[PDB]
Design an enzyme around this catalytic site. Sequence first.
Site, PDB file in Angstrom:
ATOM      1  N   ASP A 165      -7.182   6.036  -5.022  1.00 27.42           N
ATOM      2  CA  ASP A 165      -6.700   4.664  -5.079  1.00 27.42           C
ATOM      3  C   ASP A 165      -6.929   4.113  -6.489  1.00 27.42           C
ATOM      4  O   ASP A 165      -7.134   4.872  -7.440  1.00 27.42           O
ATOM      5  CB  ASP A 165      -7.376   3.829  -3.985  1.00 27.42           C
ATOM      6  CG  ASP A 165      -8.888   3.792  -4.120  1.00 27.42           C
ATOM      7  OD1 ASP A 165      -9.437   4.505  -4.987  1.00 27.42           O
ATOM      8  OD2 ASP A 165      -9.533   3.045  -3.354  1.00 27.42           O
ATOM      9  N   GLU A 221       0.802  -1.217   0.000  1.00 27.81           N
ATOM     10  CA  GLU A 221       0.000   0.000   0.000  1.00 27.81           C
ATOM     11  C   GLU A 221       0.837   1.270   0.000  1.00 27.81           C
ATOM     12  O   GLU A 221       0.552   2.197  -0.764  1.00 27.81           O
ATOM     13  CB  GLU A 221      -0.947   0.003   1.209  1.00 27.81           C
ATOM     14  CG  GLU A 221      -2.050  -1.041   1.139  1.00 27.81           C
TER      15      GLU A 221
END
Lengths: 443, 8
Positions: A223, A214
């Site tokens: 994202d 991440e």
Amino acid sequence: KEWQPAVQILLYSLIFLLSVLGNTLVITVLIRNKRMRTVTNIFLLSLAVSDLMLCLFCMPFNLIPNLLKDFIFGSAVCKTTTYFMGTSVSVSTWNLVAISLERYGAICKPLQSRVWQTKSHALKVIAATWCLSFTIMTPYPIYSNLVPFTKNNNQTANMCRFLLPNDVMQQSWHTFLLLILFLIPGIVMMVAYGLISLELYQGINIFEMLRIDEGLRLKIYKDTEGYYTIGIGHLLTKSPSLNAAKSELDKAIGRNTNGVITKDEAEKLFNQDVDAAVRGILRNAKLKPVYDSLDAVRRAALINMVFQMGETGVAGFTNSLRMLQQKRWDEAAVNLAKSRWYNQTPNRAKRVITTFRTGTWDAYAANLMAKKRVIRMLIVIVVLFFLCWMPIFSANAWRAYDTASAERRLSGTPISFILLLSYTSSCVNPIIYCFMNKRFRLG
Amino acid sequence: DFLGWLXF
């Protein structure tokens, strides 16, 4: 006979060329590339300056006086060389413990060591290491004089010897040095490198895996799906509301950062999200049966999927979930390589699948294997440094307690090789730096 | 008869 001087010349000339080519190289590549000047390499620059100080300013004044059996040089250089010979070993030992303390704070306790890995801290401790080393080794220029002696047929000749007032002050000095330069630096480095090797043996964990998959972005960022995420993959809201992303963030934390969360704030939210992902598996009647029958490596991969997709999303992988419970790993990998999650994020999905197939952390064993390579090198240079300087310090203690027997047994060729071993320590460090990166290709 | 050695 002729063989002892001949081998002493070619040995000393080789180690002089080796230590003057490598140490000059490492001080150049560090002063040229600011990208290489890490906190560890700053100490290694000081360690390389002392090795060149000991090779250039001291190694000649140790061989050619021995080959001549007379100290033709003045009395002021007998005080200067012994001063620099003692300062060089003191900074080298205490810079080798500075890197051990640096690697301990950066690995074992990365939270409370921020005051150590700052570049201004390393500069003031190498300044203190060099300053106090010149102050501690002050007795050497004071109590070093020329001792006259006769060689052949009333041939007057001088020798440079370190002589203190009494034998009590002599044996308490060599004991002080063996204690402050070898024993104390030895135990503080075994507890440092031992505790480091304990952390590195713990291997990769799920929190390090998710932090790799991440990353950390302090500002609110889009994202792969397009929604605003913050920190380490913490989704703000799926609804298209730019204002609710700031409100939901400030609702969790303790202030209105307006999207500027500190690095310690993101770790508290990242720890809470993992707890919400592992307790979502426990309440799910489809994920809990397969979670209890998986390896620690494979269990972390299942939580990595819940972190990215959610409890309900991964619970729909009924074909792959049963394949994982069927312990048929290679077949579950092919079934997972055909989903939407694999095509939306191919790089993240390939890593999580290889951990399911093999049950090993090989997909994320990269930065851990690089940290293992640095520590193994630092351990070798410490063992090689002690192996070189122990024969001379132990022989100096024997000379301080039994001067007659120590000088009788070793004063010609044995002490000539003992000192040669202590001078090889200056060139072995550059050789190790080379042998790390593709120098083994040469042949 | 050099006997002994220079300090370091």
